[PDB]
Design a protein around this nucleic acid. Structure first.
Ligand SMILES: [Mg+2]
Ligand SMILES: [Mg+2]
Ligand SMILES: [Mg+2]
Ligand SMILES: [Mg+2]
Ligand SMILES: [Mg+2]
Ligand SMILES: [Mg+2]
Ligand SMILES: [Mg+2]
Ligand SMILES: [Mg+2]
Ligand SMILES: [Mg+2]
Ligand SMILES: [Mg+2]
Ligand SMILES: [Mg+2]
Ligand SMILES: [Mg+2]
Ligand SMILES: [Mg+2]
Ligand SMILES: [Mg+2]
Ligand SMILES: [Mg+2]
Ligand SMILES: [Mg+2]
Ligand SMILES: [Mg+2]
Lengths: 76, 185, 141, 124, 55
RNA sequence: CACGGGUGACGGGGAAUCAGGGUUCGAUUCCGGAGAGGGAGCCUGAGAAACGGCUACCACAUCCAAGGAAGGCAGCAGGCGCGCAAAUUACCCACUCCCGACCCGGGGAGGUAGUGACGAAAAAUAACAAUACAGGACUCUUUCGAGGCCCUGUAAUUGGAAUGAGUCCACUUUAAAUCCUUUAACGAGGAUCCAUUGGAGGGCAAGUCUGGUGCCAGCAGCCGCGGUAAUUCCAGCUCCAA
């Protein structure tokens, strides 16, 4: 599902909040031409996708970094 | 702290009443007489006339045989003579107040090309100014608002890079010649 | 001037400084009570949340049902009966939406047929109601 | 049909050079290149074109006149003594390094962190 | 009641826009305005009709 | 008019509106003052109560092995929040100067580019010729009609003549580039390479035109319009303001 950059982050947060019990989180980053990068996320059931352009990487990467640091925790 | 000017000024001032019928009548007659583009072209010459008349009133409020008054009056008369609106025998600071927007619009390079007669119409002269066919003192003038000086009045002619003058023909003429030679063989 | 002495500057200045406050525009502009009563707080535009749509009955001779929106502001939280300007544009505004609220050109005063309405709506969810009326843009759904 | 005239001629013995404002008339063509400018100044002033450095052309409207500044050194050693390295690299006798400025700042801030002889060992 | 919103805007007849030759603009529009104001008409007796006057 | 209070008050040169007088603003590139989250103290040093210096407390926050360590973008970019409201995590010390042991090194000061309809200046979107027509100074004719030495406009009638906007080799520009100017070759007849923003009762320039609605929708900054022939709504056409 191709969404907005902010809607992608909200649905990605909802993917972790749904996978607080069981389920994998798949994040695929790749080059995109048709400068842009394709960033897609998959829990196994519902797929979301976005394309991040050059105009919004400073707005995107910092909130995405805080999202990952808040949502990923392994073993001590 | 950057190195730049920040100096600018509006050259036109809008009138106080927007829909005066006699004012629109006079401005529409001015545009239809001298080949203008909008009402801003009337209003900016009106505001330069307002500048000149305000300077003239400020000189007439000064006393006679004042050095600043004499210097500014002689300089303003020299400017009016060199733009060629006021005559060289008429030059006195009391005659500046009796000067008109029509005599200011007479010194337009569009109007001067129309009076010299190298162009057919006033708007056709403006087309020639836009399309860069005429020059003034070996310098191409692309803008019709060029205030032609009285000393530089006689140097108005066609430019060198011009098909109407001594130059290469235009795109339509080259395309028609190429199409004719291609049809002939 | 009434007292025309040579050195009555402080008398004229104190008398004019006392008598400026009886003007309606001067006192409203220089007291903070009108600025406190103003929901915008000295602002030209304001965003706010739609919560309900109200059909307001009209005043004397002209009798109709004007359309208003109970806008709850963000910068203060105050409630404004904002006016939907154009025809058939109440259907675009849904519940729980952010709308931009401006004045009506009488500087905070009720205008014409509508009692107790000072403000109106310009934009609806970052899409202008003028373009929604003309049909140029579409509401994002 | 290209004509070069000189204005404001000055002899800097304290810089060991000549200098003038160059006025180029070229009807019927575009702006002539700096190599042709150096060649025509060389055949004008009877010197080698290696010492003649010309820069800063501005073309007037209409298309028949440019204005540019140019200096004529005495020797290539004096030119390398007082001539800027960027205008030397315009012609190619000097070549500046390709070390980018942000990476040089990063290298300097990395050498600032480590104290001792290992400042050279931090870099690569 | 708020059930009658957009009533007349819904129930008016949708008339399609007529195709039209493009108008001259700017100095040419003002020149054509000057030509249709002054140099065409003649002084006539009685009250002069307006530009949009029709009967 | 002290003292006290408020300021949605850094002060000034200045900005806007302006007859003459005034009113409002000034955070904003220049001069001076204050400051680096809130205060307080100090070493060094000619010059600091300095925070891209430390020392303690409060608010906020990072790592940790739980013994401990480290922070101050009201700098340049950029981010969250707050919002009616505000730009690139670029290139370079080449122009300006500043500092150092100094001709050589450094400068997010500064310069140049990216966004940019805050604003200011100039300013494309057509012009000419030929047909039909509609008319104005002359001659002629009682009018009707006629000749063109002089004309002016209109009509998706036709015709070549001229140019950018774009495309794009090449110079020039510049620290290296970009843009401007120059310059080949392309490039326009609905020259579709199509200019919109508001209004048409009055103030206020501009339809008693047509269809629908029938005090409903709505228009209307003020007066007012709409209750089944709306010059005021909604659509078409026409016109007017820039
Ligand atoms: Mg205060
Ligand atoms: Mg200040
Ligand atoms: Mg403040
Ligand atoms: Mg300080
Ligand atoms: Mg301190
Ligand atoms: Mg400091
Ligand atoms: Mg800091
Ligand atoms: Mg803004
Ligand atoms: Mg430097
Ligand atoms: Mg240096
Ligand atoms: Mg700076
Ligand atoms: Mg266009
Ligand atoms: Mg209408
Ligand atoms: Mg009106
Ligand atoms: Mg009227
Ligand atoms: Mg009333
Ligand atoms: Mg009206």
């Amino acid at each position: 599902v191709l969404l907005e950059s902010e809607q992608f982050l909200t649905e990605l947060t909802r993917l972790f909040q749904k996978c607080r019990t069981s389920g994998s989180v798949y994040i695929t980053l790749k080059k995109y031409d048709g400068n842009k990068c394709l960033l897609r996320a998959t829990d196994g059931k519902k797929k979301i996708s976005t394309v991040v352009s050059s105009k919004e990487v400073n707005k995107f990467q910092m909130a995405y970094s805080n999202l990952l640091r808040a949502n990923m925790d392994g073993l001590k | 702290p950057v190195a730049r000017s920040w100096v600018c000024r509006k050259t036109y001032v809008t009138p106080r009443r927007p829909f005066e019928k006699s004012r629109l009548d006079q401005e529409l007659k001015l545009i239809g007489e001298y080949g203008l583009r909008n009402k801003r072209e009337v209003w900016r010459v009106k505001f330069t006339l307002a500048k000149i008349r305000k300077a003239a009133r400020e000189l007439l409020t000064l006393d006679e045989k004042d050095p600043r008054r004499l210097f500014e009056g002689n300089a303003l008369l020299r400017r009016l003579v060199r733009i060629g609106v006021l005559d060289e025998g008429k030059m006195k600071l009391d005659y500046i107040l009796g000067l008109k927007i029509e005599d200011f619009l007479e010194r337009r390079l569009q109007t001067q090309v129309f009076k010299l007669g190298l162009a057919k119409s006033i708007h056709h002269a403006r087309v020639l100014i836009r399309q860069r066919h005429i020059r003034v003192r070996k310098q191409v003038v692309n803008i019709p608002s060029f205030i032609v000086r009285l000393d530089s009045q006689k140097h108005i002619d066609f430019s060198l890079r011009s098909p109407y003058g001594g130059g290469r023909p235009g795109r339509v003429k080259r395309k028609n010649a190429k199409k004719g030679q291609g049809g002939a063989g | 001037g009434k007292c025309r002495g040579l050195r009555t500057a402080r008398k004229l200045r104190s008398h004019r400084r006392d008598q400026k406050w009886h003007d309606k525009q001067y006192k409203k502009a220089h007291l903070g009570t009108a600025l406190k009563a103003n929901p915008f707080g000295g602002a030209s535009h304001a965003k706010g949340i739609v919560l309900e749509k109200v059909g307001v009955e009209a005043k004397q001779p002209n009798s109709a049902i004007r359309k208003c929106v109970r806008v709850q502001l963000i910068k203060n939280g105050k409630k404004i009966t904002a006016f939907v300007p154009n025809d058939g544009c109440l259907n675009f505004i849904e519940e729980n939406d952010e709308v931009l609220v401006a004045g009506f050109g009488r500087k905070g005063h009720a205008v014409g047929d509508i009692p107790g309405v000072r403000f109106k709506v310009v934009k609806v969810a970052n899409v202008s109601l003028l373009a929604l009326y003309k049909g140029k843009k579409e509401r994002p759904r | 049909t290209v004509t070069i005239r000189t204005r404001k001629f000055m002899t800097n013995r304290l810089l060991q050079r000549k200098q003038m404002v160059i006025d180029v008339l070229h009807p019927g063509k575009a702006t002539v290149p700096k190599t042709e400018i150096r060649e025509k100044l060389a055949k004008m002033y009877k010197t080698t074109p290696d010492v003649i450095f010309v820069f800063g052309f501005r073309t007037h409207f209409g298309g028949g006149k440019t204005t540019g500044f140019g200096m004529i050194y005495d020797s290539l050693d004096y030119a390398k003594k007082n001539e800027p390295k960027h205008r030397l690299a315009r012609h190619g006798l000097y070549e500046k390094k390709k070390t980018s400025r942000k990476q040089r700042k990063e290298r300097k801030n990395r050498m600032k962190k480590v104290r001792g002889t290992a400042k050279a060992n931090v870099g690569a | 009641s708020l059930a009658r919103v957009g009533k007349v805007r819904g129930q008016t007849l949708k008339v399609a826009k007529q195709e039209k030759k493009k108008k001259r603009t700017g100095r040419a529009k003002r020149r054509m305005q000057y030509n249709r104001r002054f140099v065409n008409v003649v002084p006539t007796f009685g009250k002069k009709k307006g530009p949009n006057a029709n009967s």
